[PDB]
Each structure stands twice: as C-alpha cells, then as structure tokens.
Enzyme design. Structure first.
Site, PDB file in Angstrom:
ATOM      1  N   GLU A   1      -1.743   9.882 -38.918  1.00 15.52           N
ATOM      2  CA  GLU A   1      -0.354   9.812 -38.446  1.00 15.52           C
ATOM      3  C   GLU A   1      -0.321   9.827 -36.936  1.00 15.52           C
ATOM      4  OE1 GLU A   1       3.563   9.411 -37.613  1.00 15.52           O
ATOM      5  OE2 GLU A   1       2.629  11.245 -36.924  1.00 15.52           O
TER       6      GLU A   1
ATOM      7  N   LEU B   1       3.898  20.954 -34.126  1.00 18.36           N
ATOM      8  CA  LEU B   1       4.413  20.182 -35.258  1.00 18.36           C
ATOM      9  C   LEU B   1       4.685  21.108 -36.446  1.00 18.36           C
ATOM     10  CD1 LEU B   1       3.104  16.513 -35.091  1.00 18.36           C
ATOM     11  CD2 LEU B   1       4.989  17.561 -33.802  1.00 18.36           C
TER      12      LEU B   1
END
Ligand code: NDP
Ligand code: D2F
EC number: 1.5.1.3
Length: 186
Positions: A30, A22
């Site tokens: 999240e 990411l």
C-alpha cells in the site's frame, strides 16, 4: 504545471491517522503504491510536487524526510522556514499553488499531490477546478483521531478504472483494501 490531486488511505470509519501514525498496521505494498503514484511524473525533466501540512511532515520518520524524487512543500503559518530536509514552506494552500507559477517552480513541477492532513484535504476538495482523488479504501474499522473529509459524490465521479491502478481487492496482514480514483471538474 500539471494535474492537481489528493492521495489518501482511509478506513471504513474514515480514519486517516491516530496520534501521528497510521490507524492500521504497516501495509507494505500500500505504501509502495503511494510512493509510486506520487513519484511517477508524466513529463521528462520535471518532478512531482507533494504538499502536506506540518503534522503530516513530522509524521514521516526523521531519517526518511524528504520523500525522495519529489519536491516537498510544507504548509504552516507558525514555522518561518522549511523544516529540516523540506524544500518549500507556504502559509496556505492558495499560496503553495500560486508559488507553483513562480520562476523558481513553474518549469520544474509536473503533478501536484496533496498528501494531508485533514484540513488540507478538505480545502483542496472544496476548491473549484479539475481535481482527482486517489483513495485507498481500507475495508475495516480502525481506531482513529484524524479523519478524511466527506467526498461529495454529486461532484466527484468514481472512475470505472485508471491506468496503473489495480482494480481488484488487495490484502496484506489480513486486511483487505482496494484502490479508487475520483474526478471532479467544477
Ligand atoms: N492517507 C493517510 O492515511 C494519511 C494520514 N495522515 C495522518 O494524519 C496525521 C496528521 O494530520 P493532521 O493532524 O490533520 O495535520 P496536518 O498535516 O494538516 O498538519 C496540521 C499543521 O500544518 C499546518 N496546516 C495544515 N493546513 C494548513 C494550511 N492551509 N495553511 C497553513 N498551514 C496549514 C498547521 O500548522 P501551523 O499550526 O504551524 O500553522 C497545522 O497545525 C499524520 O500524522 C498522519 O498519521 C496524513 C496524511 C494522509
Ligand atoms: C506524506 C505521507 C506519507 C505516507 C503516509 C500516509 C499517506 C498519506 O497519503 C497516503 N495515501 C496512501 N495511499 N497511503 C498512505 N499511507 C498515505 C504516512 C505518514 C506517516 C507514517 C506512515 C505513512 O504511510 C506508511
């Protein structure tokens, strides 16, 4: 089989990944939201299906493959069998969806969740029919090498709210983000 959906988190410059990870630091709630949305099935006796490209599969930590409580399908033309820990392998998106009608899956699958990467998003988003996108806007720029495709707002309507989705601004590790739901039917 039930709805077709994409889910993604994206930075302000449309980034979704950087070298198989990411772009942003881990955002624990999240990721909990991703887990919750893709795992929760509307129909009893069924599981949701997740469809992902080969690089997205291998981006999941090895110990954490498959995503639990969901049927895991990998897309690849190179691979000849599902990778270690995966359930199904299809050579394309149309083949994976066609598979969802077969005897082996027709009665087992509720919602289908496309969880990346770029080219699988793009094909799904350009595919006729009823489709929703669940999009987390990570509201900072992050260096990225893979990007979310353009959302055509002529056809994808941003919904004014959605059950089970928080509408207000979230923040973890100093990074503000917010959840959105888009819908098309064409
Ligand atoms: N929300 C988020 O922030 C998300 C982030 N990501 C990130 O982006 C990275 C991976 O993304 P990306 O590089 O775009 O890769 P993909 O996951 O789409 O994987 C590409 C591989 O899968 C196969 N593939 C992809 N689409 C198809 C298709 N229609 N038919 C057959 N095979 C297909 C190809 O395999 P082959 O060459 O074997 O045919 C290709 O090399 C991840 O590592 C992750 O970090 C991914 C999803 C979501
Ligand atoms: C099979 C994808 C598993 C979740 C993932 C990326 C997301 C794909 O769609 C997503 N949607 C949302 N709202 N958040 C996400 N994070 C992803 C991911 C991949 C590799 C390492 C860490 C990751 O998240 C910590």
């Amino acid at each position: 089989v039930g709805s077709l959906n994409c889910i993604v988190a994206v930075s302000q410059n449309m980034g979704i990944g950087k070298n198989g990870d990411l772009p942003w630091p881990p955002l624990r709630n999240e990721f909990r939201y991703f887990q919750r949305m893709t795992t929760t099935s509307s129909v009893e006796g069924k599981q949701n299906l997740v469809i992902m490209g080969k690089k997205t599969w291998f981006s999941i930590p090895e110990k954490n493959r498959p995503l639990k409580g969901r049927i895991n399908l990998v897309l690849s033309r190179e691979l000849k069998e599902p990778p270690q820990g995966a359930h199904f392998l299809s050579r394309s998106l149309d083949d994976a969806l066609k598979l969802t009608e077969q005897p082996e899956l027709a009665n087992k699958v509720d919602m289908v969740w496309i969880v990346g990467g770029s080219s699988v998003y793009k094909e799904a988003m350009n595919h006729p029919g009823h489709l929703k996108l669940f999009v987390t806007r990570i509201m900072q720029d992050f260096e990225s090498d893979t990007f979310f495709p353009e959302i055509d707002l002529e056809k994808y309507k941003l919904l004014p709210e959605y059950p089970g989705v928080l509408s207000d601004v979230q923040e973890e590790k100093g990074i503000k983000y917010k959840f959105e739901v888009y819908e098309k039917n064409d």
